[PDB]
Structure 1
Amino acid sequence: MLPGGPVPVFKKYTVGSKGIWEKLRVLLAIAPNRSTGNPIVPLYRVPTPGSRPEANVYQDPSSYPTNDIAENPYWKRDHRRAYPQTAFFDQKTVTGLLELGSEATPRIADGEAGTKALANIANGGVSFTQALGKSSKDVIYGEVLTVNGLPPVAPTLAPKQWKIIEGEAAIYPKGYPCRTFH
């Protein structure tokens, strides 16, 4: 058998038949495994929800480092005021990253010279197409495109490599026009 059945009747929690009527049912049933579907009164919904003993012992559940009373400041587990800013990049802020570079790969002059170099781009001093044409191969092939020269693809956060299940594990047999992917 598989991890998903079939299972007999004496493990299903339904009200069945008893005696000769069970022998007759297993004779006259397309699938004797199957149940009437009526729940078993002693078990289902017993004890009633308004008489559960477990409500007197119940206590509000918690997790340890948040219920810790001593070294549990809120300003460390304040994840709302740590929210990530909505970054905005107009063509000005992108040409500066092109003509100049970035904190990881600087290409900028030191001192007030480089400061006014930033200032020339903050205003309309140099344009995006001008610095796209003034960009050496190492700039584009490594900061706009890839090192291989190919453009990047629409990224996936959590990639999914699909797989097919066929034959016996599958939900439906081979003949049917539906299949099963893991």
Structure 2
Amino acid sequence: SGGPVPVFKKYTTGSKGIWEKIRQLLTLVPNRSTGNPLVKNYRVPPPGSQTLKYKDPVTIPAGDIVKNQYYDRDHRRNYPRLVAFDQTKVSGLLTLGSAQNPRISVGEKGQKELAVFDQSVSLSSTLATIDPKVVKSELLAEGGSPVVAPSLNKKMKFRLTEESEHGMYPEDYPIRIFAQN
């Protein structure tokens, strides 16, 4: 927890000897820093005089000379395709089912039903004449419950916290602090 820290543990120029004793007596908060960076510590090796020998970092699976076929990591050309669902295809999915739960007849009898949804088929007409259990199981969820808008992050919860934890303003200030929970 980011509690108070003594002044000598902060990388700022401070007072010495008698002038340090005087500062502690007169300052309301003696542990605060003056904000002047330490001349002997801050930026003492300048970026142009660093002794570090830099090397380009490379990962093994994607930056090696072996077992590194590019198409195995070519995510840009394996982008998701853009698919739009109109009322004709939704009616087909509702009437014939999906490939996950097929409800379409077999053989030539099944291809007749598929060719129905190759032209305009209104969804309202499909809903008008259809078994209601299909709507309660495919279009709706949990036996007819409405489909709630899906969350962008299911782990976005919060919990109310008190001053002893978050260290912010006490309860008499008109703001509150929510943690991750």
Q: One fold, TM greater than 0.5?
A: yes
Q: Does 1:100 align with 2:123?
A: no
Query: Helix, strand or coil for the counterpart of 2:84?
Result: strand
Shift of residue 179 of structure 1?
A: 1.0
The whole-number CA distance in structure 1 between the counterparts of 2:49 and 2:122 is 75
Aligned to 1:25: 23
Q: 1:119 Cα shift? A: 1.6
* 1:151 CA drift (Å): 0.6
Q: Is the 8 A contact 1:101 1:107 kept in 2?
A: yes
Q: What does 1:35-114 align with in structure 2 at a 5 Å threshold? A: 35-54=33-52, 57-114=53-110
Amino acid at match of 1:85: R
Counterpart contact for 1:98–1:135, Cα < 8 Å: no
Decide which of 163, 171, 176 is 1:174's aligned counterpart.
Answer: 171
Larger proportion of helix: 2
* Matched residue type, 2:132: K
The count of aligned residue pairs is 177
Aligned to 1:146: 141
Q: Deviation at 1:113?
A: 3.0
CA distance in 2: counterparts of 1:34 and 1:68, whole angstroms: 51
Deviation, structure 1 residue 111: 2.4
Query: Structure 1: which 5+ runs fail to align?
Result: none
CA distance in 2, matches of 1:136, 1:88: 26
* Paired residues of 2:8 and 2:14 also in contact (CA < 8 A): no
Aligned mates of 2:101, 2:132 — CA distance in 1: 15
Aligned to 1:123: 119
TM-fit CA distance, 1:166: 1.2
- 1:163 matched residue in structure 2: 159
CA distance in 2, matches of 1:49, 1:128: 67
Q: Secondary structure at the match of 1:89?
A: strand
Structure 1 pair 147–174 and aligned structure 2 pair: CA distance change class (3 A): closer
Secondary structure at 1:143 match in 2: helix
Q: Quick check: 1:16–1:36 contact (8 Å CA) kept in 2?
A: yes
Alpha-carbon separation, structure 2, partners of 1:148 and 1:121: 27
Work out the CA distance in 2 between the residues paired with 1:37 and 1:157: 42
| d(CA) in 2 for partners of 1:73, 1:131 | 49
Q: Give the RMSD, CA atoms, in angstroms.
A: 1.3
TM-score for the superposition, normalised by structure 2: 0.92
